[PDB]
Structures are given as C-alpha cells and as structure tokens.
Design a protein around this ligand. Structure first.
Ligand SMILES: *CCC(=O)N1CCN2C(=O)c3cc(F)c(-c4ccc(F)c5sc(N)c(C#N)c45)c(Cl)c3OCC[C@H]2C1
Ligand SMILES: Nc1nc2c(ncn2[C@@H]2O[C@H](COP(=O)(O)OP(=O)(O)O)[C@@H](O)[C@H]2O)c(=O)[nH]1
Ligand SMILES: [Mg+2]
Length: 167
C-alpha cells in the first residue's frame, strides 16, 4: 500500500522542517521556501508496511488546471500552522477550502498540525486548535520538527484517516 500525503500551510510554519525531519531524521534551521519536492519513506503502521509519498508544497500560489490536478492526487493532507503565529492559524481556513474544492468532498482525510511546540512564545492555545479540529471532525496533533515531538504521530494519524476512508 502507498499513501500520497500532502503537507500544506502558510509560509514559515515548518512544512519543510517537518518533512525533512520525517525523511532525513534531522532538523533544518533554514530551507529555501521555493523548494518543492516529493519524498518516499517506508514505514510500519499498525503492523502494515506501507510506502508514504510526501509532497512538501512550496513556492507561490497557482490556480491552474495543472496545479489543481496535481493537488487532487493527494489522498490526505496535513494542515500545518505554527503555535506562535496566529495568522498561520487563521490561514488554515483557506487551505481547507482549496482541498474541499479540488477533492470535491467534505470528508477528505486531514490532520491539523500545530508545529513549533518546542517554542515558549505560544499565541495559539491548544484548546483553540482542538475546538476548531472538533468542529471540522479531524484529529489535532502538536509537533516539533526540531525535537521530533509528534512527527511520526502526525503522519501516521493521517495514514490511519486515509485507511478508514478507503476501507
Ligand atoms: C513561503 C512559501 C510557502 O510555503 N507558501 C506560500 C504560498 N502558498 C500558497 O499560497 C498556497 C495556498 C494553497 F491553498 C494551496 C493549495 C492547497 C490545497 C489545494 F487543494 C490546492 S489546489 C491549488 N491550485 C492550490 C494552490 N495554489 C492549493 C497551495 Cl498548493 C499553495 O501553494 C503552495 C505554497 C503555499 C505556502
Ligand atoms: N523551533 C522550531 N523552529 C522550527 C520548527 N519547524 C520549523 N522551524 C523553523 O521555522 C522556519 C520555517 O520552517 P520551514 O520548514 O522553512 O517552513 P515552511 O515555509 O512551512 O516550509 C525555519 O527557520 C525552521 O528552522 C519547529 O518545530 N521548531
Ligand atoms: Mg518550505
């Protein structure tokens, strides 16, 4: 089994850092915000070996048929915000709207991810993110790409959401 996962969210939330921690087992202090790539990782989740194909979205917005088609290939989406950036949390609505549009569905596998959980400067309350996740009917996971907190849990939770949706 192979799962196409797409990491989305505003600039600077840690999409690349999360992806590179997952794939390469190290934290990036800076990562060019124009670099977009897909990465593969073999994992075992609930006793089943699977291949994750992870798209780390980057660059500028693009509302073309080709870009929509590419994003539509995603089976599940990580909605990433940073816990020290309220605007990034505000932006989650936009990302969800675009996913709902291209997937033409209200039941797309998604996980809300509050990244940078290692930092002291929190501006988004855990309870606020949990309330919105509850309203959306999706899991919420706090992560740190720096320390590895929650990283596997975020991606593996998303896989579990996909498995439930496709079986
Ligand atoms: C700092 C650079 C960065 O990481 N950025 C800035 C620009 N970004 C976007 O504006 C962006 C928004 C967005 F909603 C999507 C997107 C999500 C889901 C989806 F189904 C579709 S279809 C479609 N077309 C787009 C677009 N555009 C989306 C994406 Cl893919 C964005 O661009 C990626 C970078 C993102 C964060
Ligand atoms: N302390 C801390 N910094 C992080 C974390 N995730 C990302 N960063 C930093 O935040 C900045 C933006 O990360 P990046 O992955 O480029 O964000 P992207 O634009 O969403 O791809 C970089 O300086 C990263 O080192 C995290 O969990 N903790
Ligand atoms: Mg990036």
């Amino acid at each position: 089994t192979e799962y196409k996962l797409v990491v989305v969210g505003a600039c600077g939330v840690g999409k690349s850092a999360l992806t590179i921690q997952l794939i390469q087992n190290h934290f990036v202090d800076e990562y060019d915000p124009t670099i977009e790539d897909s990465y593969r990782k073999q994992v075992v989740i609930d006793g089943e070996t699977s291949l994750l194909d992870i798209l780390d979205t980057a660059g500028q917005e693009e509302y073309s048929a080709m870009r929509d088609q590419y994003m539509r290939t995603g089976e599940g989406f990580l909605l990433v915000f940073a816990i020290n950036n309220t605007k990034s949390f505000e932006d989650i609505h936009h990302y969800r709207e675009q996913i709902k549009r291209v997937k033409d569905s209200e039941d797309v596998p998604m996980v809300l991810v509050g990244n940078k959980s290692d930092l002291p400067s929190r501006t988004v309350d855990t309870k606020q993110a949990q309330d919105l996740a509850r309203s959306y009917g999706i899991p919420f996971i706090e992560t740190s790409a720096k320390t590895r907190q929650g990283v596997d849990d975020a991606f593996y939770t998303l896989v579990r959401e996909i498995r439930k949706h496709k079986e």
